[PDB]
Amino acid sequence: MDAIKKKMQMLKLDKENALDRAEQAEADKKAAEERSKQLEDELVALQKKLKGTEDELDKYSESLKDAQEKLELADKKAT
């Protein structure tokens, strides 16, 4: 094949190989973005579960405070 024609064939092949690289990276990028969206949703659900747990801890801490409160007034006459 003529040298000039061969060079042109190679430039075309190089372009195609690069477009293929871009297509694959763009697909991988979209995949990562979707994974990140799902992870953000997991973090929000977990944060809500933690908030619920902290609220319950406060409820227990308050109830315990009342109990130790009543226990003192109670054991006033253990004899």
Place this chain on the structure above:
Amino acid sequence: MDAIKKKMQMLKLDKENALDRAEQAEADKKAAEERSKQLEDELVALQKKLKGTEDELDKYSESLKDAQEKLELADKK
């Protein structure tokens, strides 16, 4: 310049443009995947915080139950 040298020039241009797009795309993929990794670490850390909170909650439930047991002893006297 001949049309043959000119066509060759346009082909070299198409190639450079495709390569530029490929490199930008690979850089965006890298950045996106790093963000996913960052979120994964935030999740591990949050799960650890929740576990520690659930452990403290168990500690208080046990103490409250014990104080209720003792309060029963008081009344039952």
